[PDB]
């Protein structure tokens, strides 16, 4: 209808699930964006429901540490999500390349992540799929902002009202309440944040096993620890935050607001 008229396609940034991201400019404005080009014809019934949800949910979110959706356009057989341009790749590839972060850089990183999650929550959005793969870096430059992305699995919540919103997310990062098929809500994002912080500081995750059955046992039991030697020189307040985030009871589990007031985030 109206993308072909205002936007000029440019070079490919990446491929995906019947998607192709190109750099684009809004011609008249001159400003440059990322256009996620989705093929309607090759999408499942279920995939359309997500696209619509992703579009609706992303529209609510204006924050410096969320990837902004500026526009969502439906033409014949093709759907275009117009996003902020981000040129730094995934937090994932950066953790792999640097192996692990200092307590300094881990604090700065998760602080931005927690401000992204806090905004989401205050707008009644639970993400459900926090992982390094779904965090992107603004640019290739120094101290570039971490921006939350991929709201394809995100749900809307009314206040603090828990419910069974379905089994959704990434095995390693799922919360015990989801594994227990309990009604859940905002606290599930804070368990994922736990997993991300742990990964940030030693470069491996707190819960693993070849057998998905066993991985889920560990997570439900909160069976993680802080092995020697790599954890020995890591502050007890760093660990204190992880424990407070990796609390198997979501009621006693720390919130985004609380986590940001935690002494390991707040001062330094």
């Amino acid at each position: 209808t109206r993308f072909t008229e205002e936007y000029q396609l440019f070079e490919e940034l990446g491929k995906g699930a019947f998607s192709v991201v190109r750099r684009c400019v809004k011609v008249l404005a001159g400003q440059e964006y990322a256009a996620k080009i989705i093929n309607t014809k090759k999408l499942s019934a279920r995939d359309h429901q997500k696209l619509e949800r992703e579009a609706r949910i992303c529209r609510l979110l204006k924050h410096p540490n969320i990837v902004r959706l500026h526009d969502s356009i439906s033409e014949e057989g093709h759907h275009y999500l117009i996003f902020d341009l981000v040129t730094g790749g995934e937090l994932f590839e950066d953790i792999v390349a640097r192996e692990y972060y200092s307590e300094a850089d881990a604090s700065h990183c998760i602080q931005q992540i927690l401000e992204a999650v806090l905004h989401c929550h205050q707008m009644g959005v639970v993400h459900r799929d926090l992982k390094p793969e779904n965090l992107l870096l603004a640019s290739k430059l120094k101290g570039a902002a971490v921006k939350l992305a991929d709201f394809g699995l995100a749900i809307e919540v009314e206040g603090e009202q828990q419910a069974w919103f379905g089994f959704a997310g990434t095995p390693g990062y799922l919360s015990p309440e989801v594994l227990r098929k309990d009604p859940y809500g905002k606290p599930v994002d804070l368990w994922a944040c736990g997993v991300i912080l742990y990964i940030l500081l030693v470069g491996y995750p707190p819960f693993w096993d070849e057998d998905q059955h066993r991985l889920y046992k560990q997570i439900k039991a909160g069976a993680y620890d802080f092995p020697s030697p790599e954890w020995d020189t890591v502050t007890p307040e760093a660990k204190d935050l992880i424990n407070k985030m990796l609390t198997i009871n979501p009621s006693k589990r720390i919130t985004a607001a609380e986590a940001l007031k935690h002494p390991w985030i707040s001062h330094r």
Partner: peptide, 16 residues
């Protein structure tokens, strides 16, 4: 110890 590999998003329970 466990090492860090990339994990995919599921939208349903899929026993693996």
């Amino acid at each position: 110890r466990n090492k860090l590999r990339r994990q995919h998003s599921y939208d349903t329970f899929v026993d693996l």
